[PDB]
Amino acid sequence: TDTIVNVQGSFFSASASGVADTESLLIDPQDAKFGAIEIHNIAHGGSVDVELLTSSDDTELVEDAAVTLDSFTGEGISQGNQIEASDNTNTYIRITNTSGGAIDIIATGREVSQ
């Protein structure tokens, strides 16, 4: 019977160098081609809060629902998560610095269909 090779769906990443003390990386699934994302990895460079938000606005972040998912301390990687967000459901992931000084944040995952 018919054999197909399955390669895995589109890589997604968001990153920021030198995020100031209280500032954040806003991961926007509007930047995805498919308009939805699943973040697997948050590599954080110093302490961060990870936060899942719904916007009132279809294109910009105006906070409606906001939940702090978890707090990460020091430098490292949270690997193999499935935090999910889409363009049309107005969902956003914010990774906020809490280190007392500037950090590098890299978030990676996969694009998902809406």
Partner 1 sequence: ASDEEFARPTGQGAEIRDDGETYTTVAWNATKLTEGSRVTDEMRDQAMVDLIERNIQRVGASLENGINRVFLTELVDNAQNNHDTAGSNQGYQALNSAVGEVDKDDFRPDTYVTHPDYRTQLFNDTNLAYANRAGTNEVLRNREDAPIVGDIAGLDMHAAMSSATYDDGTDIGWSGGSETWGFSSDGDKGAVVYDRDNIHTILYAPNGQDVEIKDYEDPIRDITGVNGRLHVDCQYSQGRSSATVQY
The enclosing H or E element of 35 equals strand 35-43
Q: Which residue has the tokens 């697997």?
A: 40
Q: Number of residues interacting with partner 1: please give it, by CB under 8 A.
A: 14
Nearest-approach distance from CB 24 to its own copies, in angstroms: 14
Q: DSSP class of residue 30?
A: G
Q: Which residue has the tokens 């702090």?
A: 68
One residue of 14, 50, 85, 86 binding partner 1 per CB under 8 A? 86
Rule CB under 5 A: say whether 51 interacts with Mg ion.
no
CA–CA dist 7, 70 (Å, integer): 31
Binding positions for its own copies, rule: CB under 8 A:
1-11, 13, 15-17, 34, 36, 38, 40-41, 43-45, 52, 54, 64-70, 75-77, 79-86, 89, 91, 104-106, 108-114
Rule CB under 8 A: say whether 6 interacts with partner 1.
no
CB atoms inside a 10 Å sphere around CB 61: 16
Site for Mg ion in 58-87 (CB under 5 A): 58, 87
Q: How many residues does the chain have?
A: 114
One residue of 90, 96, 97, 99 binding partner 1 per CB under 8 A? 90
